[PDB]
């Protein structure tokens, strides 16, 4: 279980956006897009 709880977190950072929650699929419409939604749009440190 516990590794699976570790596993899902690593998935969850790659599946969904941490903040806006939407997911990988909506941002794969633009190429290289989920990484942009993780490095430009929300990119956790900025809200910090």
Partner 1 sequence: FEEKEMEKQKLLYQQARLHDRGAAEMVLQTISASKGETGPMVAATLKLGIAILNGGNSTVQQKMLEYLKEKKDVGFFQSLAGLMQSCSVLDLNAFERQNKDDEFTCDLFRFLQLLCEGHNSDFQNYLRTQTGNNTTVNIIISTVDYLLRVQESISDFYWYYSGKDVIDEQGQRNFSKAIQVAKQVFNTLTEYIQGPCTGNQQSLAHSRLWDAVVGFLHVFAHMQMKLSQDSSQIELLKELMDLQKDMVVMLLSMLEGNVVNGTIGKQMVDMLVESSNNVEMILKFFDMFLKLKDLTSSDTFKEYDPDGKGVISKRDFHKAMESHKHYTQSETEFLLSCAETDENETLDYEEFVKREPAKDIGFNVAVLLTNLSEHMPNDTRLQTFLELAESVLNYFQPFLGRIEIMGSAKRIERVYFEISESSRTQWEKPQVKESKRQFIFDVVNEGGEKEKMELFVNFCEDTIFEMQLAAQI
Binding site for Zn ion (CB under 5 A): 17, 19-20, 42
Q: How far is the C-alpha of 15 from the C-alpha of 2, rounded, in Å?
A: 19
Burial of 15 per CB tally in 10 Å (0-12, 13-18, 19+) = middle
Residue 17 near which of partner 1, Zn ion, none (CB within 5-8 Å, type-dependent): Zn ion
Site string for partner 1, 8-37 (x = CB under 8 A): xx--xx----xxx-------x--xx-----
> CA–CA separation, 29 vs 35, rounded Å?
12
Q: Which residues bind partner 1 (CB under 8 A)?
A: 5-6, 8-9, 12-13, 18-20, 28, 31-32, 40-48
């Amino acid at each position: 279980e516990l590794r699976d709880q570790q596993e899902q977190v690593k998935e969850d950072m790659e599946t969904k956006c941490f903040i806006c929650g939407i997911g990988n699929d909506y941002f794969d419409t633009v190429p290289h897009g989920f990484e942009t939604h993780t490095l430009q749009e929300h990119n956790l440190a900025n809200y910090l």
